[PDB]
Design a protein around this nucleic acid. Structure first.
Ligand code: MG
Ligand code: MG
Lengths: 419, 469, 469, 419
DNA sequence: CTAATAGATTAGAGCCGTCA
RNA sequence: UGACGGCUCUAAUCUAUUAGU
DNA sequence: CTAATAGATTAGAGCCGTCA
RNA sequence: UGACGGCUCUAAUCUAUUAGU
């Protein structure tokens, strides 16, 4: 014998039956059950009868609402009754009542006069009672070892729960910067430009630094705002190459690597802002940064390459937006993040932070990875100019190019996505 | 086209020397390491709260099923799992008349009423502990909803006592520090979520499918506060000490006086795990500076090293000081001055505000849990939140962000640092979950920082984590 | 010729509502009132002490048999009696090196060496209570016999250290009042009595035939100190609260002065016994004046009345003041000024000085325990010690002295006062005996006073008894 | 047929059923009941019927508010009645009532004509009742243990042992005062006696008080030490009868009823000291009082009326000693306190406190009530004067009479002295 | 010392969803 | 505050420069 | 205020048996 | 101090009175 049969309502009583099987195996009891094994097929009933008749010592029946009046369960009950009659064993079938709804009045006739082990109140009490009954009846057993139960858990519970050594491809939000100008400029206007001219109003990016103006533009560029510009010699311009200041190989008492890199980042940010302003795209003011969004109906049927960017929710319209930041670490990038904004009808914004935040929280519940990926890629591809690039004007002839496809990452380990 | 590597699951050790990858499965299959015999509970509040707790205790005694047996594991019962009894018969009850709450919650000034309510609870708790012959292990407080609603700092009602914070929970835990009494606080609405509704006929919070998770969390917290050791890490290498430092502001003071708190973890040479907060609040009077003065840094490092020496017998061979901020040169020099000879000092920074997301193009499921991107020899991007093959779901809803781990000061291997940071996230005892987004050493310290800041009278505060979470 | 009257014994209330006259059989049949789950023991001391403690804990599991069953009942095992678990598996050890103990007892000054030993022993307990995670129910200190013989008031070896009484036990229990930690002190000879011997091959203390009583005593002590109630009085008359006062001299504090401490008992709602102290010494500058000034007496009565009012909600119908001094008109006029009109104050005096003795004619055993001789309406002799037919022996040798009860103030019946004093002798939780020779109100107050006056002033001392005895 | 059946209402009476079953098992009986013996997986009705019918010598029924009107209890009662009819044993069913809320007029119809055993007062009394019934009915007891089951049986039968009603006579250590002198007097010596004569050293008891001397002696007495006494008018005296002094009556500005009952006590103590000095009895100085003892051999073979007062213990000789104190509360009596002193050679004491204490403690082990009583009585009888009285000298003629037998007390409660 | 302009750090709050 | 996640609205500080010191 | 004579009370310390 | 009891030794204090303060 040396084996203990367990029957249940597959798959309604998986929890208790599987827990009891693992527990009993962990204590050194040989337990035979259906869901425990994985291989199945036509030859699944002859083995049941042979095991019950030949090498089964105790029959435990998980009697619940589902397990009662079950054809397979009743067949197992009949076979167990025959085996019990043959073996002259008074105690061979043991009911285990795990359902509170299953009253003792409406139980099956095959088990109506038998003393049942109750599990409704506390499962540990029932486990202790089963152990005591097995000990009193001298059920054969081995030494208690939880290693067998752990092995069964590892090899059955986690069969299709492992990890797959499959290569994959990842899209990101990192856009690489392709082109840079040749040199940087610190035009020297010795008390030539107005003291408080507000140089952040010029048609080209510029930053004040000592008495110098830093810009990628030409020496005589932006002369419309500075009429007193032509009478200026070329020798008074400090030209610094871009490659060395991006590589950190230019240290001067005039300026160090840190401040020059900071100025380059500032110029990139201002150029991005001005260029996006040129595209005629609506603006949104966040807590610290600024976002850009399209109106409703700006595109053809509110779609671009079969991907919708503007939509209707209840009595408002929702707009997808992207925000960019010019950063030089680890490699020159223009990092991109996503946001959602809400307007009354698609043309005018609603002046309420709480409403916007609550609406975004409600909207983002049902969106998944594919939705964000498609929207981000579509809005990035909207901006690009000719085939693969997007240019920012840093001067009369200088341009900075950003690619429209994000940087990919290659990984070697993935999953089997089992629904 | 960069390259990513994979980091394997930490293993959390369980009873009888068997290992697993999920805390819930190990608890429900084998049992805890130590064996507490019983838990005696003390309930404070109105008769409604006592009935609520009694009903909840009677309810949690039997298995509760969730929506999905694979997504969130089941709850096979408190006693059937923890091998201990926590029921509604050893309850010791202390009432608070509703007129007292009414006569107290009318001042309309948050500080005075917060102090008054905290006093009205703690005085009875202390008196019961002092002048009664029973033995209460864990003290449960059923906080009424109307008390909770208006005790928030920036909330409105539609000098002697001003040296305190404007929060009920913080101050309530703070003034019980010197009496060494473990305390658990339950919202009245949380325990009985069904009877509290809105003008729609539905509960404000729907716990229908997630009662199993709630039961797991509450049972684990109550077991840990009662002196239990549920699970421990598997392969912590000998001779490594982790020490996290967290900075905080102070509500009222002549100066901002930024406060510093610390938390400590290492191996106990007895195949255990020592995880305790080594905190004596250090102070910096300078405004906005999040670097300790040299004397404070010397004191902190000396105290931590001495604690390690007394607990084991020798100085550590490796000290990873996790912090959320970069260190300046003078602080690192001061750390070096109080350092032994054969002791490697490493300063690591963990940050979250770094815009970077990765999208899976084929499916609609997020990235794997254990992936990692190595930028250089001194930094990396580590993933901890996302899809796990064991639980068949993602730890978050949207596309999660990864963590940026930087070896700011000293020499260390980035892969080993990432492995340790990932393995540290399976020891959050305040909840029973598969994984978290932040390591425990920089998390529990935060809680310490928000307890012993609400009051200034505490000298030599307790260290064990059973009085802070 | 004079006559002697007899009073029967007030039996107590064990489990299931059962009643019995002797504590041993009362516990052996029905068990304690409350049911503990198990006792976790923490041990502080050396390695030999830990080994001996584990050996004794193992030995007290199996039945232990006495020489004479009629005089002393057997010990059938701790689990079979108290229905809880106390095994050598939840034992937690903290080592105190023999080097420290040896080096501290070398200053040749009793005060300094006692201070050093007490500080050494209590620092580890405070650290293990405030910093560690485990749970300790009762701390069992195991002191070596070589320090007990030297920590005595008048002991000779063959800085805020002079402000404490030169006794180890008193100061040890006095210094831990502010941290609320139970403690049980053992001498190494008390447990391992067979190993300690004398010039002859016999132990100094012979427990061969009284081993069962030793087991019963230690078992009941550990049961009470872990939060158990072994028994309670069967009948306590309603509306009546009983007091007990003891005077203790504050030795060597800037002057010869004295203080007073109290204990009280009453029956509260729910048929429970509120058996609790009344703390806070009340002094008087005069030396040798075993009395109280009016200001301190009014405070004492107000405190007792308010303490009863808080629990019951009604002013007591009757108040009894057991004491071993005699009141004067000044302090009794200080009384009755805060005493309610629906309250009667009876001031009763109990003493054992007047030398009367009774011998039975043509016999060999002594007089019974229930006999009493009433001289007047305001005087009585009560034989609280004597022969007990139930155990077929006497509680003392030779002829015991009678106990003098004198109603010093108030009007009442002598029979009722004698009955109450006889009943107040069945509440010796520290022991497992038939009855005690003096009322517990006059002994537990003395135990309190011996501890409160062996240290500096401490505010609001604990009122429970498990922290003192 | 050696098994006892217990019928109850599961789970309403589990506690008492388990308690009685455990007690009976510890006694040595074989007990079958539901909760104690509940096999799992067996037909419970058939097993219960087989147990009741084949092997059952007694049927213990538990009757209470719960077990009344129960289907299983009634069926077991019916089968037990059938077995009783088939066995012809009129004491087969034994009811046991454990509920105070169950009236005797509402019992089951099947047990109305049966003698029940009341468990209301105490489970011990009912247990002893049922054990007495079993012993009377000769219930087979399976004794498989020695010195443990017998000790369990001997433990009970002793808690109910109590006192019996019988008058007893006790002796005491109080000697009643029989008579007093009629007058006490305050002789007026107007600064006649020396200022520091130290009056306590003369022959008769006297006490100084203001300019007066208080003594029971006559006016012209004690002239041997105060010769200048004859020239003294006898009218210069204040006389108050002693009978009214010992009545709480006399009070005056000269002396208050209080200082009175102190002066008389002092005079009695001084008279006792002088009288015991006159009897040639050796003395010992204790911490506070003074004791008197007899030398070795001064009695005939150290015995007085078949009682021994001086004995031998190893290298020491023990002597019985008494100390006297005169008290007036409640009535004039002389209190005698016993002591045991030790001498080296029977004539010289030892000037060491430790050895005296140790020797007395060693001597106190063997003595019992009879020894102490006989020794005190013999000592007092030796101190007697003529037949039953003993006088103390207060002056020339006045004397105080005290009995030589202690006050006898009588009681109504005693014990049987069960050896 | 204070007041504008940028980057790169940090810390406090409050709000919504967790299933189908 | 039984957890965890992701958002929006706010404040100091450091560096660089200019002008009020 | 100091010092002796007593009665009448109160508090501390120190030591030994517990069975046959 | 694992309990209990019984003895022994010291030291204040109150009261009455007496004498120098
Ligand atoms: Mg908590
Ligand atoms: Mg004790």
């Amino acid at each position: 014998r040396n084996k203990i049969f367990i029957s249940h309502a597959t798959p309604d009583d998986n929890d208790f039956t599987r827990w009891l099987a693992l527990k009993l195996i962990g204590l050194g009891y040989e337990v035979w059950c259906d869901i425990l094994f994985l291989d199945k097929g036509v030859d699944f009933w002859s083995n049941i009868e042979k095991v019950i008749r030949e090498d089964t010592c105790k029959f435990l029946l998980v009697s619940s609402s589902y397990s009662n009046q079950r054809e397979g369960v009743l067949k197992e009950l009949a076979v167990a009754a025959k085996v019990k009659k043959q073996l002259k064993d008074d105690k061979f079938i043991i009911p285990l009542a795990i359902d509170e709804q299953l009253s003792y009045d409406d139980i099956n006739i095959d088990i109506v006069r038998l003393n049942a082990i109750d599990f409704k109140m506390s499962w540990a009490r029932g486990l202790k009672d089963i152990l005591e009954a097995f000990e009193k009846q001298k059920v054969p057993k081995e030494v208690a070892d939880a290693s067998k139960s752990n092995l069964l858990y590892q090899q059955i519970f986690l069969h299709d729960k492992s990890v797959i050594e499959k290569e994959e491809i990842y899209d990101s939000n990192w856009l690489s910067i392709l082109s840079f100008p040749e040199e940087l400029r610190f035009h020297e206007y010795n008390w030539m430009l107005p003291k408080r001219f507000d140089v952040r109003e010029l048609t080209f990016p510029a930053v004040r630094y000592k008495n110098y103006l830093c810009t990628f533009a030409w020496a005589y560029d932006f002369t419309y705002h500075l009429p007193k510009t032509e009478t200026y010699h070329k020798s008074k311009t400090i030209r610094i190459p871009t490659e060395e200041i991006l590589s950190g190989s230019y240290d001067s008492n005039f300026i160090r690597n840190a401040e020059c890199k900071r100025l380059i980042v500032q110029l990139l940010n201002k150029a991005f802002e001005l260029r996006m302003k040129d595209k005629e795209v609506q603006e949104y003011e966040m807590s610290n940064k600024t976002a850009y969004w399209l109106e409703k109906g700006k595109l053809e049927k509110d779609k671009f390459e079969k991907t919708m960017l503007v939509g209707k929710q209840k009595d408002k319209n929702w707009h997808f937006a992207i925000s960019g930041a010019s950063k030089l670490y680890p490699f020159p990038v223009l990092m991109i993040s996503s946001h959602i904004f809400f307007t009354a009808d698609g043309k005018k914004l609603i002046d309420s932070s709480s409403v916007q935040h609550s609406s975004r929280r409600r909207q983002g519940k049902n969106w998944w990875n594919n939705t964000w990926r498609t929207k981000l890629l579509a809005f990035i591809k909207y901006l690009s100019d000719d085939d693969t690039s997007f240019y920012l004007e840093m001067g009369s002839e200088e341009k900075v190019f950003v690619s429209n496809e994000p940087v990919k990452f290659k990984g070697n380990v993935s999953y089997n996505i089992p629904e | 086209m960069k390259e990513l590597i994979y980091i394997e699951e930490p293993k959390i050790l369980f009873a009888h020397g068997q290992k697993c990858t999920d805390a819930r499965d190990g608890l429900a299959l084998f049992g805890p390491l130590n064996n507490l015999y019983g838990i005696k509970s003390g309930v404070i509040g109105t008769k409604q709260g006592l009935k609520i707790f009694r009903d909840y205790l009677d309810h949690i005694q039997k298995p509760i099923y969730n929506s999905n047996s694979i997504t969130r594991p089941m709850f096979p019962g408190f006693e059937a799992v923890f091998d201990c009894k926590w029921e509604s018969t050893g309850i010791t009850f202390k009432e608070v008349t509703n007129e007292d709450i009414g006569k107290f919650l009318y001042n309309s000034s948050t500080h005075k009423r917060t102090y008054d309510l905290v006093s009205l609870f703690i005085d009875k708790i202390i008196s019961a502990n002092k002048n009664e012959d029973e033995n209460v292990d864990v003290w449960f407080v059923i906080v009424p909803d109307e008390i909770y609603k208006y005790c928030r700092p920036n909330s409105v009602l539609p000098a002697e006592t001003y040296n305190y914070d404007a929060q009920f929970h913080d101050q309530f835990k703070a003034r019980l520090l010197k009496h060494t009494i473990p305390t658990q606080i339950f919202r009245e609405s949380t325990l009985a979520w069904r009877d509290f509704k809105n003008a729609f006929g539905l509960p404000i919070r729907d716990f229908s499918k997630i009662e199993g998770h709630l039961a797991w969390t509450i049972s684990t917290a109550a077991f840990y506060k009662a002196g239990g050791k549920p699970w421990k890490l598997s392969d912590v290498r000998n001779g490594v000490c982790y020490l996290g430092l967290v900075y905080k502001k102070v509500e009222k003071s002549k100066n901002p006086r930024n406060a510093c708190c610390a938390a400590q973890m290492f191996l106990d040479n007895g195949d255990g795990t020592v995880f305790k907060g080594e905190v004596g609040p250090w102070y910096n009077p300078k405004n906005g500076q999040y670097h300790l003065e040299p004397k404070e840094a010397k004191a902190l490092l000396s105290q931590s090293l001495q604690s390690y020496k007394e607990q084991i017998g020798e100085y550590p061979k490796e000290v990873f000081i996790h912090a959320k901020t970069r260190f300046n040169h003078q602080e690192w020099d001061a750390f070096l001055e109080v350092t032994p000879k054969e002791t490697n000092l490493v300063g690591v920074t963990i940050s979250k505000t770094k815009p970077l997301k990765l999208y899976k193009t084929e499916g609609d499921y997020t990235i794997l849990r254990g992936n990692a991107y190595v930028v250089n020899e001194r930094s990396a991007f580590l993933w901890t939140v996302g899809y796990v093959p064991k639980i068949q779901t993602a730890l978050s809803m949207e596309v999660p962000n990864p963590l940026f781990i930087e070896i700011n000061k000293g020499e260390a291997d980035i892969k080993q640092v990432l492995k340790d940071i990932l393995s540290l996230t399976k020891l959050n005892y305040n909840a029973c979950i598969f994984a978290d987004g932040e390591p425990v050493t920089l998390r529990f310290a935060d809680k310490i920082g928000e307890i012993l800041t609400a009051s200034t009278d505490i000298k030599t505060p307790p260290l064990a984590f059973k009085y802070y979470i």
